[PDB]
Design a protein around this nucleic acid. Structure first.
Ligand SMILES: [Mg+2]
Ligand SMILES: [Zn+2]
Lengths: 1340, 612
DNA sequence: TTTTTTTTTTTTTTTTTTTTTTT
DNA sequence: AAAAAAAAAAAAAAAAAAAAAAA
């Protein structure tokens, strides 16, 4: 079924795969995170509750005074969003925390607290997030792009050592914690394990273990197993382990069990090992010389006198063997030595171990962290414990613990956030195992190890920083705390937390000014996954293993969409269906597959879980039961792809477009497109300016609807019903009766947004797209936003194009454009600038904004007002004064006679220099609004009072009219109730609306309801009065500004650019182009029946830079407009429904295999006529990205119109009137107008304003700057013989004031001549050197 | 004061915001000559402002200077006339953003357009490398009269047909002009106007314009060629020669000296550059500029009148594609089954799989290239016969307009086996051209190679930048300061043999460079050319006819000079042709030539094959 | 067999917000 | 205590020790 707004225009859809999981609510990653941050969590596992209970409780050292946290609440914001945009403050709200402080007596720790107190104390102010996932922080929407970073946990990374010219692999383990100090280990080239806590001076890896209080024997036992030995006659017998003999050769004749198992020189083959095990061959005689190569396991001490014969980790010499034999040491147990499988690299580390004392290792760490400090036992122990063990300075967060436990194959999923002995021990174990050929390594660019940090986590992090700081302050005060003489306001301080959090949401690299020049730009810039930011990979330190695309991005990150240039592949986007797992790893949905039945139930899989199973690609067909029609269905596996059997499939994709992002799934026919050009097309679409009148794209993808609805700027309804009263600035919706509240419904008052500036100078204008009285269903589109059209997103506009190389003007990639496209003015934006003029108070009196200005003609003052501010609607131009501002004539100059004058005061009527802010050169405009802002204690002047009264009167009108409309709804409800009971018509309509309860009504609930409504009416009166007073107060009170400013007046210029011969239009498949000429309507080439063509692109951009998608788009657009022309012809003849209904039904069928299956039979022919009216200039066609529309369908669709099947038509040449041979393509490629506008690019310069200290011409487009003559151009001139031009680019046009003036004189005087002579810079340098005692003389 | 960025030693090197500057987006400029740069009005009344003041106050239209200022700011009609007068001949310097080459600061004359976009002649879009998709060029001006003469003599866009590094021209028809030329001259077996003898070229153009004879029409005409057979004399010979009507039409643009056969083929991007270069060598410079203008114009016009447009139906797919792919699939199936049995190890199985995929890819590529090319069977007024096709994709590829055989293969044939992100070649290739659709798996695979290419280019940008900087740092010292060092120790150049694959003959690597010892013919006691002689093209031809396998050439690697390098010992400048005149710096010529072409740089028994 | 000289490989030293100073 | 001004946001030098060579 189709709602009213949907029924306005059904988009023909070519899709085939039945959707099972519709597109989710975009921006979910943002709203879910932030609601997680602020929402009162009773369990308090995440959010502000978690941070508070982490930092709390508090108490000074032996203070007998404990500060505890009770609860937290987020009060209402002081302002609301719209006035926040107007004013400039953050859209923040207070954060009131209920705290409790209790203090005991002396020698009563456990005794009852002597005194208590509790208060809802103010605890900082926190920014909030609007309904679009944006933050209004300084009169502008800042979006906190979520970041991507290496997850906390342990990552045994090989770290392939391409250095050393040896190929050796320096296996590296890195226990990265979420909060604390790192801890990594690596094998050095000498096969010795080393540690460098926090990347400071490397230390032997053993050190921490012997700093962990582990004895050398304990260290050896933990790292190494042992081999038992026994002195038994000559050639002491040792426990034979045939398993240990694996990967070893018989260094001696193995003749045990009366059998020659292995003669000397032969390996111990599997045959011999099996024979040994079968006979249970065990401890046997072995040579002592063979044992000589072993290493002593324990610390053998001569028992006769208790003298250390030898500590462990020493090789066995026969003298030592005899010595221990005489002492009675029957046991000669040695560490099991090997290299193939049990390489004891840590034994070599122990050999390199400089010391063994625990305190010695503590001192080693103490010097390691803080070099050169005085060694100390207590401080060293505290350092060693607090680096890892102490919770406060180290915390593997729950994500970190989970990853760490899973990496070490622990049975457990949850544990403490601090490490332990066994943790590092097992890390070392697996590290040596990997180096010993037991275990592969992880790759950090596998999304299982990458993690997605949203806004909420970042806010919690910064707020926890603030909490620990204020807690430190609290402890400071408590240690000096007085006895119950101050409640928790002196101990507390809101300033640090507020400063920290506003520093984050404001000045941070992840709070970018929202990209608002299109709805798609907004939504893409929200759903963004950046690899930069704190604790991340800086855009130059990152290499290439991360700028690449890993084979798990599929379903979690769009390969196509990413900015190019400096940082390519660091700023990946998010798939359309992607989510964030509870830990924060990018999951994705898959269709559960039980046997052949692909069950429509959906399961969300993380990154690692994907590999464990085998998945089918989305466009694998089915047979109405979920069974794969092709039994050996293509499927993907642990980074692989093969034809798996019909039963060897555990999951299937949800839809044909979960690999891409919305920023690139809007592309149609994306399948028939190279990845490079699709990437550039997605980047282009993201920055398309919203033209004057939105135009529904003629070839969409079915994703434009959802993108526009969920982006935020479409004024989506809230409750269904009827549209009581449309308007250009407001829509009022009478609610449907069922959806009405228990009382006082019938009111929506959707305040549309008339013209206002965007964050890139593009009008954000919302227009109403509902006819009066039309019913509306919930969640529909009442008012089109900027670049929206009945809900559908409309970025650019259609334009009938003809791929043919015209006379050159489309040479490289240029684009003709017939005058018609600019004549009918379909590309024309409404850029709205914001010039801000301020009035500071510097030395020598304040700045004056008076209209009185010296040295200005009457023309400038003609349009100003008396105060000095231009009137609204003043068609200003270049150079006109917007604001009349002046300064008090410099400073203290001349001589002490000037000080005498100042004592007497000067004698100047003017006594003020001109500093008025004019229109920037080269821009027209019609002033819309001029806001005035006043520092408190500054009396509002004439213009300020004018605006103040205007806004106050308008606000009075607004409150009055909303109250009136709500009262009208209330009385309509009263009348509806009075239809039954008290229905006296004459008595009802005789008396006025003063009393509609005195009418007769028996004992019924109706009169009780009327009494409730009357209470609502009186409450409405009182609430209206209070809102009115509050609004008056807010308007009247002066707004605090930056220091030293009396008042600032900001004026919003509005301009109407036009498509012109330097812009940069671009299709959607990356096919850029700069408009090269605006031809007359005639010179364009016109098809057979007269209609010209509005663009002539260059064909030779197709075959190379292969993006043949756009040709398919052109053809399908041609067919779309063909059906449109057919419907237009039928309507112009005023055909009778049957013709229309039949034709539209046929066009919508076109369904060899499709999913539309629409029917216009039950369509209320009036609505069929409305549909024809909305389709009479095109039949919109959808084409999901990879379940596209095949060519044969396009041929049939064109054939439905009378147009030729080829997609090509003969075009006549307008200028001559002959025929182009070689018939040419003509279709409707939906072209954009990217906001690289020529008149924001061009910037001339002859002798404009110069610089401050460099004294060169001032650089920058914002200040009339000339192109920079960098070094490489200096080389370019040197290569040529041209020298004078270089010598003049360096001296007579950079800094030489005398040379500049002389050259200007010569030019105006008519002489073309530089002045030969060394530039004065040489003279300055010469005197500089002569300052030093250096001759630095000249020569010949 | 003598240290750091503000140190007054390294101060004129950091960068200076030069006055009289400019900027704009760029726009194509056909109808311009090859030495004209369409400059906007709104930017040419703020560049030549002081010049306007001078010519205005001098003319007396407004004697006082402030009146002149207020007149120009008043847009009075006279100021347009005065500005036209001052910019009558006042060369401007158009500079692209990264100025690797020494052509990247070429200078043009101005012609004023309306609007705001620095037009730019199409042919000179190559040296700049601009692409008219948002590229922005800066306009400087030379003030002092010496600087004007430099901008007109040393840098004018019409005195740099030959780039510094490689001798051959860098004003070479590029994208649409070559497609137009290609279309304008192609042999069609039978078409309107077939089988007739018209006249010289004039009646050929008359026939085409009237529509009587189609553009492609194998027909005999009477072109007369003025060949320089005699010593510096235009010897004229005329005769009934076969050609095409379009070929006769194009012949009118060729200047006198060239022989007719220079344009009788189907002019691609190769033969057209060869024609332009031959015109250079035979009739000097200025005729080459006139001929480049004419070729660009008569290429654009007939490209338009052709209307070569890329309909989708012209990317023909082989009907044998699916059969070949099924055969390859069966092959990999048998190989995999055999590997499962253990008869072949995993590595051998994988190598065999990729090899048979490569073989199938070759088969499909040959099939599609055969369907695109030829394949046009048409009656010749008798029976049928086949001719090279006119499909717009194939027409482009054969012409070399933009897109060689590889890319059209990717458009119609299998698009290959995309290597995994590491670099190892994927076992299962992409078996779907672009005309048919890709699949989520296949497209997601292609993104790997695409993004790796993009990132590697982005890095190689700065790599080539650093390399150029080092080179110009160690080369800027030199300057050709000695006419002749009078040495004898020049290296002996020979054709370079790449292990049995001699590529560069003695032609190039001794072209122009001055011989040290007198070239001796292989015949004994037969001095071919004297000692200190310039090896221009005719002497090179003499070397070819004598086929000298080794000649001693003076080399700058060892010239007896104190602080420079001999003029003779350097050779030709390889930007103008004649021996390098005293002064022109070669170090910052060299460094940049060995620089700029850096980003293009990618980041048992012998069988005798010849008679000898 | 012992001492001295030379090499080499390892280590350590080199436009906006905040902080410190002044009134 | 408030307001205004200044500055922060891997290469190589030296030296210990190991190894060569001469007395
Ligand atoms: Mg470009
Ligand atoms: Zn020389």
């Amino acid at each position: 079924v189709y709602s009213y707004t949907e029924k306005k225009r059904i988009r023909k859809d070519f899709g085939k795969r039945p959707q099972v999981l519709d597109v989710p609510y975009l921006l979910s990653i943002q709203l879910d995170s932030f609601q997680k941050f602020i929402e009162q969590d009773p369990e308090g596992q995440y959010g502000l509750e978690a941070a508070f209970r982490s930092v709390f409780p508090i108490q000074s050292y032996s203070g007998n005074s404990e500060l505890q946290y009770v609860s937290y609440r987020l009060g209402e914001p002081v302002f609301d969003v719209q006035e926040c945009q107007i004013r400039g403050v953050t859209y923040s709200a207070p954060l009131r925390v209920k705290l409790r402080l209790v203090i005991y007596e002396r020698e009563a720790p456990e005794g009852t607290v002597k005194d208590i107190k509790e208060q809802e104390v103010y605890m900082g102010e926190i920014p909030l997030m609007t309904d679009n996932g944006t933050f209004v922080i300084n009169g502008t929407e800042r979006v906190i792009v979520s970041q991507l970073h290496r997850s906390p946990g342990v990552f045994f990374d090989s770290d392939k050592g391409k250095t050393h010219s040896s190929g050796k692999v320096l296996y590296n383990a890195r226990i990265i914690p979420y909060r604390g100090s790192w801890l990594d280990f690596e094998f050095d080239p000498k096969d010795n394990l080393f540690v460098r806590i926090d990347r400071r001076r490397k230390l032997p890896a053993t050190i921490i273990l012997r700093a962990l209080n582990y004895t050398t024997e304990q260290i050896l036992d933990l790292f190494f197993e042992k081999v038992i030995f026994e002195i038994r006659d000559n050639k002491l017998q040792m426990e034979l382990v045939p398993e240990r003999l694996r990967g070893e050769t018989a260094s001696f004749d193995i003749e045990a069990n009366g059998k020659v198992y292995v003669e000397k020189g032969r390996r111990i083959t599997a045959r011999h090992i099996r024979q040994l095990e079968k006979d249970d061959v065990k401890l046997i005689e072995v040579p002592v010389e063979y044992i000589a190569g072993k290493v002593v396991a324990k610390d053998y001490i001569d028992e006769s006198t208790g003298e250390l014969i030898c500590a462990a980790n020493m090789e066995l010499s026969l003298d030592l063997l005899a010595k221990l034999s005489q002492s009675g040491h029957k046991r000669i147990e040695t560490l099991f030595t090997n290299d193939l499988d049990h390489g004891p690299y840590i034994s070599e580390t122990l050999r390199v171990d400089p010391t063994n004392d625990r305190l010695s290792a503590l001192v080693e760490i103490y010097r390691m962290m803080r070099p050169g400090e005085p060694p100390t036992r207590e401080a060293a122990e505290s350092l060693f414990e607090n680096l890892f063990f102490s919770e406060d300075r180290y915390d593997l967060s729950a994500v970190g613990r989970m990853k760490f436990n899973r990496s070490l194959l622990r049975e457990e999923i949850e544990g403490s956030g601090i490490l332990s002995k066994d943790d590092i021990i097992d890390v070392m174990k697996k590290l040596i195992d990997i180096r010993n050929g037991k275990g592969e390594v992880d790759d950090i660019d596998h999304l299982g190890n990458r993690r997605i940090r949203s806004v909420g986590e970042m806010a919690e992090n910064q707020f926890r920083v603030g909490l620990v700081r204020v807690e430190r302050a609290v402890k400071e005060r408590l240690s000096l705390g007085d006895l119950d003489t101050l409640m928790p306001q002196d101990m507390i301080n809101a300033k640090p937390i507020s400063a920290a959090v506003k520093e984050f949401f404001g000045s941070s690299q992840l709070s970018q000014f929202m990209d608002q020049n299109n709805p798609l730009s907004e939504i893409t810039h929200k759903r963004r996954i950046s690899a930069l930011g704190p604790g991340g990979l800086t855009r130059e330190r990152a290499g290439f293993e991360v700028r690449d695309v890993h084979p798990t991005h599929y379903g979690r990150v769009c390969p196509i969409e990413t900015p190019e240039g400096p940082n390519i592949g660091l700023i990946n986007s998010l798939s359309v269906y992607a989510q964030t797992n509870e830990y924060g790893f990018l999951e994705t949905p898959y269709r559960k597959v039980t046997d052949g039945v692909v069950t429509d139930e959906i399961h969300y899989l993380s990154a690692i879980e994907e590999g464990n199973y085998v998945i089918a690609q989305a466009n694998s067909n089915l047979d109405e039961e979920g069974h794969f029609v092709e039994d050996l269905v293509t499927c993907r596996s642990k980074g692989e792809s093969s034809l798996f059997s019909r039963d060897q499939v555990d999951y299937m994709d949800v839809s044909t477009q979960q690999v891409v992002s919305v920023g690139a799934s809007l592309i149609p026919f994306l399948e028939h497109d190279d990845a490079n050009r699709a990437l550039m097309g997605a980047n282009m679409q993201r920055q398309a300016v919203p033209t004057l009148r939105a135009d529904k794209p003629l070839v969409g993808t079915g994703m434009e609807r959802a993108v526009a609805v969920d982006s935020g700027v479409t004024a989506v309804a809230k409750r269904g019903g009827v549209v009581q009263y449309v308007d250009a600035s407001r829509i009022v919706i009478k609610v449907n009766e069922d959806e009405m509240y228990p009382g006082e419904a019938g009111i929506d008052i959707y305040n549309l947004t008339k013209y206002t500036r965007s964050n890139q100078n593009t009008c954000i204008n919302q227009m109403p797209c509902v006819s009066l009285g039309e019913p509306v269903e919930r969640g529909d589109v009442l008012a089109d936003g900027p670049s929206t059209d009945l809900g559908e997103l409309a970025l650019g506009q259609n334009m009938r194009v003809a791929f043919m190389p015209w006379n050159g003007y489309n040479f490289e990639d240029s684009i003709l454009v017939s005058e018609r496209v600019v004549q009918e003015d379909r590309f024309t934006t409404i850029h709205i600038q914001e010039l801000a003029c301020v009035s500071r108070d510097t030395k020598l009196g304040p700045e004056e904004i008076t209209a009185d200005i010296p040295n200005v003609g009457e023309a400038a003052l003609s349009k100003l007002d008396e105060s000095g501010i231009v009137y609204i609607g003043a068609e200003v131009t270049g150079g006109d004064i917007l604001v009349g501002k002046v300064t008090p004539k410099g400073e203290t100059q001349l001589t002490p006679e000037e000080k005498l004058l100042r004592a007497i005061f000067g004698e100047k009527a003017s006594d003020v220099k001109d500093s008025s802010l004019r229109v920037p050169n080269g821009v027209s405009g019609t002033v819309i609004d001029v806001q005035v802002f006043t520092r408190d204690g500054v009396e509002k002047d004439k213009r300020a009072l004018e605006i103040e009264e205007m806004q106050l009167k308008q606000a009075k009108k607004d409150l009055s009219e909303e109250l009136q409309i709500l009262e009208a709804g209330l009385f309509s409800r009263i009348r509806a109730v009075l239809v039954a009971g008290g229905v006296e018509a004459e008595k009802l309509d005789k008396l006025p609306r003063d009393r509609w309860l005195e009418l007769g009504l028996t004992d019924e609930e109706k009169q009780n309801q009327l009494e409730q409504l009357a209470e609502q009416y009186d409450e409405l009166k009182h609430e209206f009065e209070k809102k009115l007073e509050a609004k008056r107060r807010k308007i009247t009170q002066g707004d605090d500004l930056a220091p030293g400013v009396l008042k600032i007046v900001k004026v919003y210029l509005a301009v109407k650019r036009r498509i012109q011969p330097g812009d940069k239009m671009a299709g959607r498949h990356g096919n850029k182009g700069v408009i090269s000429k605006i031809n007359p309507i005639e010179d364009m080439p016109y098809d057979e029946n007269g209609t010209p063509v509005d663009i002539v692109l260059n064909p030779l951009g197709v075959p190379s830079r292969m993006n043949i998608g756009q040709i398919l788009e052109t053809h399908l657009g041609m067919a779309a407009k063909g059906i449109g022309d057919k419907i237009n012809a039928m309507l112009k003849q005023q055909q009778e429904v049957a013709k229309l209904r039949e034709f539209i039904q046929r066009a919508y069928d076109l369904g060899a295999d499709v999913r539309q299956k629409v029917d216009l039979s039950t369509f209320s022919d009036e609505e069929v006529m409305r549909l024809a009216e909305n389709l009479r200039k095109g039949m919109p066609i959808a084409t999901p990205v990879f379940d596209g529309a095949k060519e044969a369908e396009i041929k049939e669709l064109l054939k439905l119109g009378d147009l030729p099947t080829s997609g090509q038509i003969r075009l006549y040449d307008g200028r001559t009137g002959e025929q182009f041979e070689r018939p040419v393509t003509v279709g409707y490629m939906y072209m954009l107008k990217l906001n690289h506008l020529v008149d924001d690019k061009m910037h001339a310069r002859s002798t404009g304003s110069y610089s401050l200290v460099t004294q060169q011409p001032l650089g920058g487009k914002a200040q009339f700057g000339g192109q920079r003559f960098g070094e490489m151009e200096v080389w370019a001139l040197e290569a040529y013989g041209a020298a004078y031009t270089l010598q003049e680019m360096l001296t007579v046009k950079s800094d030489d004031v005398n040379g500049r003036t002389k050259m200007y004189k010569n030019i105006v005087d008519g002489n073309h001549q530089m002045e030969p002579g060394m530039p004065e810079s040489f003279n300055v340098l010469l005197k500089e050197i002569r300052s030093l005692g250096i001759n630095i003389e000249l020569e010949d | 004061m003598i240290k750091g960025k503000q140190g007054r030693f390294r101060q004129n090197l950091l960068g200076k915001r030069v006055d009289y500057s400019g900027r704009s987006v760029i726009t194509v400029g056909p109808y311009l000559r090859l030495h004209q740069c369409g400059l906007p009005k709104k930017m040419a009344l703020e560049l030549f402002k002081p010049f306007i003041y001078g010519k205005l106050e001098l003319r007396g239209l407004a004697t006082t200077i402030k009146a002149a200022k207020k007149m120009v700011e008043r847009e009075e009609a006279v100021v347009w006339d005065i500005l036209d007068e001052v910019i009558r001949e006042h060369p401007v310097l158009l500079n692209r953003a990264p100025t690797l080459h020494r052509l990247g600061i070429q200078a043009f004359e101005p012609v004023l357009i309306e609007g705001k976009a620095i037009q730019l002649h199409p042919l000179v879009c190559a040296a700049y490398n601009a692409d008219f998709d948002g590229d922005q060029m800066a306009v400087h001006v030379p003030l002092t009269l010496e600087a004007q003469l430099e901008a007109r003599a040393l840098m004018m866009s019409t005195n740099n047909i030959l780039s510094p590094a490689n001798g051959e021209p860098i004003i070479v028809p590029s994208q649409d002009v070559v497609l137009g030329l290609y279309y304008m001259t192609r042999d069609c077996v039978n078409a309107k106007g077939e089988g007739m003898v018209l006249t010289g070229p004039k009646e050929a153009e008359r026939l085409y314009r009237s529509g009587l004879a189609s553009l492609h029409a194998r027909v005999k005409v009477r072109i007369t060629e003025y060949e320089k057979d005699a010593n510096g004399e235009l010897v004229a010979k005329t005769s009934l020669k076969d050609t095409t009507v379009g070929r006769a039409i194009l012949w009118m643009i060729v200047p006198k000296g060239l022989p007719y056969s220079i344009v009788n083929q189907a002019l691609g991007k190769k033969a057209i550059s060869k024609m332009l270069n031959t015109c250079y060598r035979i009739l000097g410079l200025k005729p080459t500029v006139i001929f480049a203008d004419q070729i660009m114009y008569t290429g654009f016009a007939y490209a338009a009148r052709s209307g070569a447009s890329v309909g989708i139906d012209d990317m023909v797919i082989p009907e044998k594609k699916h059969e070949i792919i099924s055969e390859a699939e069966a092959e990999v199936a048998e190989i995999q089954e055999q590997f499962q049995s253990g008869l072949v190890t995993a590595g051998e199985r994988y190598n065999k799989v990729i090899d048979i995929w490569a073989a199938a890819n070759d088969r499909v590529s040959k099939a599609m290239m055969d369907n695109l090319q030829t394949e046009t069977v048409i009656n010749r007024d008798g029976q049928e016969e086949k001719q090279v096709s006119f499909n717009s994709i194939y027409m482009m590829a054969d012409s070399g307009a933009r897109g060689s055989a590889a890319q059209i293969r990717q458009l119609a044939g299998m698009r290959g086996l995309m290597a995994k992100p590491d670099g190892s070649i994927i076992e299962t290739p992409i078996t779907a051209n672009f005309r048919e659709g890709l699949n989520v798996l296949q497209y997601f695979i292609s993104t790997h190679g695409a993004r790796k290419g993009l990132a590697d280019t982005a890095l190689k940008t700065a790599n080539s930048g650093y390399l150029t900087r080092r080179l110009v740092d160690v080369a800027q010292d030199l300057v050709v300061t000695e006419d002749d060092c009078g040495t004898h120790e020049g290296i002996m150049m020979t054709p370079v043999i790449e292990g049995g694959d001699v590529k560069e003959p003695l032609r190039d690597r001794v072209l122009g460079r001055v011989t040290a010892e007198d070239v001796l013919k292989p015949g004994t006691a037969d001095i071919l050319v004297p000692r200190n002689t310039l090896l221009h093209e005719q002497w090179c031809d003499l070397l070819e006819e004598n086929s000298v396998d080794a000649v001693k050439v003076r080399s700058v690697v060892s010239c007896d000079t104190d602080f420079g390098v001999c003029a003779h010992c350097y050779g030709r400048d390889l930007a103008r042709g004649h021996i390098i005149n005293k002064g022109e710096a070669i170090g910052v010529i060299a460094a940049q030539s060995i620089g700029e072409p850096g980003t293009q740089l990618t980041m048992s028994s012998i069988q005798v094959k010849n008679k000898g």
